[PDB]
Amino acid sequence: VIPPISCPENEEGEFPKNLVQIKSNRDKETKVFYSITGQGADKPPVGVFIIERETGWLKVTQPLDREAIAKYILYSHAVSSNGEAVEDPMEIVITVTDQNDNRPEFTQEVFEGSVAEGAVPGTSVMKVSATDADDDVNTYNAAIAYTIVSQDPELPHKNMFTVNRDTGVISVLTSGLDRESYPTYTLVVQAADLQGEGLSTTAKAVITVKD
Ligand SMILES: [Ca+2]
Ligand SMILES: [Ca+2]
Ligand SMILES: [Ca+2]
């Protein structure tokens, strides 16, 4: 039974690239011919994986996209030159491993929040949310750090609010909210993957100051 096969997505270089060479010990008696079935082989996405029919080299023909298909299940077939299957179809599983090629994206372009002017600092005001298509499970490619890029107006302070790096909850950072003077704030919030270090997106948090 065939070992787990793994192919990083977004691969460059010359294609196709060998993945694994499948064999039949059922093939010294007979010349075996290999083929594969499954999505990625004969079924959409067709042609992503091929197998050299005389050698049993399974190859990937193009760069993969983990966010499109992370796991391929293919079946190899070993057929005699005489036209008889010499073995049961062998399942072949190809895991596509993640690259950090999706930038975080906010679920909204503009989040709306409201805070009472007298809200004590540390008061949660609102939440911004971002998603990342990359591999939350096995990488930090989907690990999103939220930040506030800017606040307008910068009054009374540059930093009326703060955002929880992890949760995107925005809180009153300081006192001084004054609905009469500054009815509203526009925060530009950033979501960066790799835990803030990676790829970035921005969104607006419009925060209305209430009585
Ligand atoms: Ca991708
Ligand atoms: Ca990816
Ligand atoms: Ca990412």
HEC letters along 159-190: CCEEECCCCCEEEECCCCCCCCCCCEEEEEEE
Q: In whole angstroms, what separates CA 123 from the centre of its chain?
A: 32
Q: How far apart are the first and last CA of the chain?
A: 69
- In the annotated binding site for Ca(2+), the residues are 101, 132
Q: For 167-170, which contacts have Cβ atoms below 8 Å and span 24 or more sequence positions?
A: 167/127, 168/127, 168/128, 168/129, 168/130, 168/144, 169/124, 169/125, 169/126, 169/127, 170/113, 170/124, 170/125, 170/126, 170/127, 170/128, 170/205, 170/207
Domains along the chain with CATH numbers = 1-99 (2.60.40.60), 100-211 (2.60.40.60)
Omega within 30 of 0 (cis) for the link into 8: no
CA angle 88, 60, 35 (to 5 degrees): 25
What residues have their beta carbon closer than 5 A to ion ligand 2?
66, 98-99, 101, 134
**Can you give the length of the chain in residues?**
211
Name the structure determination technique.
X-ray
